[PDB]
Amino acid sequence: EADCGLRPLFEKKSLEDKTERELLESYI
Amino acid sequence: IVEGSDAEIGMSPWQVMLFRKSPQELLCGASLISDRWVLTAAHCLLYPPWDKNFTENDLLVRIGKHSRTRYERNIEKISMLEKIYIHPRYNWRENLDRDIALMKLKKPVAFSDYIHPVCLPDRETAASLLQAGYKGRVTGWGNLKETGQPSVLQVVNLPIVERPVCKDSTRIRITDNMFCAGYKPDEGKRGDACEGDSGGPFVMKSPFNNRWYQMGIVSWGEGCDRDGKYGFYTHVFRLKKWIQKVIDQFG
Amino acid sequence: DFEEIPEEYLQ
Numbered sequence A: 001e002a003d004c005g006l007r008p009l010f011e012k013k014s015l016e017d018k019t020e021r022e023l024l025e026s027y028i
Numbered sequence B: 001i002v003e004g005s006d007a008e009i010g011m012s013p014w015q016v017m018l019f020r021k022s023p024q025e026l027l028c029g030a031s032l033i034s035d036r037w038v039l040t041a042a043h044c045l046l047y048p049p050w051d052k053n054f055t056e057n058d059l060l061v062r063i064g065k066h067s068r069t070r071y072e073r074n075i076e077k078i079s080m081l082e083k084i085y086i087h088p089r090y091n092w093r094e095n096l097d098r099d100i101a102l103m104k105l106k107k108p109v110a111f112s113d114y115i116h117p118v119c120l121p122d123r124e125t126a127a128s129l130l131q132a133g134y135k136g137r138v139t140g141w142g143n144l145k146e147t148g149q150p151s152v153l154q155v156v157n158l159p160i161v162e163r164p165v166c167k168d169s170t171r172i173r174i175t176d177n178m179f180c181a182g183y184k185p186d187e188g189k190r191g192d193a194c195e196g197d198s199g200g201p202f203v204m205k206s207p208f209n210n211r212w213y214q215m216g217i218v219s220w221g222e223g224c225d226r227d228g229k230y231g232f233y234t235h236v237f238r239l240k241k242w243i244q245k246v247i248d249q250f251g
Numbered sequence C: 001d002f003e004e005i006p007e008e009y010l011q
């Protein structure tokens, strides 16, 4: 789906969940 | 999930619960990949050593859930199965090689704030993200310890582990269709999937396009959260040609 | 341990 992987309550409204930053920090 | 935390509302809207009709109980996790297709581990449906061989009419899928045991009126949606497809080279005899299955729903599920599909990786995102040290996220309603059960969906973030370390942690033959994840004893932090988390997703958020991709399926481990052991996950990209073949032919 | 689900889904 064109919209896959974009969560209505997070990415769709530009809100971040409490631990996604931990993932980002590991992507070096 | 061992040593995880409560999910936030809508944190994993592709999460699916495979539910046994009789007796009513949690069977496995799974994930929503379109309005009609659900992805899970083959061993959730077929595992002869344990006399497991479910048919479509034996199960339901429950989508949009947060609470493990509650009927989440006006939020979750319950779907019947039209057909199960198990990888034809799924190796239940030895090492769970190619531990992957698809379930086609009888009717499309309506997306909502709580129900939304995850992306499957292409070659490029897999190459970029499937690297030792990079973290993914595992979710499920499985046991909180190896030897109890959660009120709500649990989540844990875990690093992908170097292949030689995965290989050296076990006597089981590892294949290119698997990867392993978890902290090493010297890393302090911990966490793992456990019984009941089987079939659920290992996801990563691409820093290139800010979308979530399902890189793995919870497959196997020796105990749960043991020092020096790691969780093993089906390598979704490696098996994507099969996924696409099934969807193209039966979709 | 699970709350009953609507009968419509068990038919």
Ligand SMILES: C[n+]1ccccc1CNC(=O)[C@@H]1CCCN1C(=O)[C@H](N)Cc1ccccc1
Pocket: B043, B047, B094, B095, B096, B172, B192, B193, B194, B195, B196, B197, B198, B218, B219, B220, B221, B222, B223, B224, B231, B232
């Ligand atoms: C228990 N566990 C830990 C981490 C992730 C997922 C799981 C759940 N998976 C399982 O319980 C699977 C199903 C069949 C036996 N099994 C296992 O994980 C076995 N403990 C190890 C095994 C692996 C491959 C072939 C035979 C045995």
Ligand SMILES: *[C@@H]1O[C@H](CO)[C@@H](O)[C@H](O)[C@H]1NC(C)=O
Pocket: B046, B048, B053, B055
């Ligand atoms: C599992 O069940 C099907 C029938 O529903 C049967 O044909 C099959 O032989 C059984 N065992 C397998 C696939 O190992």
Ligand code: NA
Pocket: B167, B168, B169, B170, B171, B172
């Ligand atoms: Na080994």
Ligand code: NA
Pocket: B182, B183, B192, B225, B226, B227, B228, B229, B230
């Ligand atoms: Na471990």
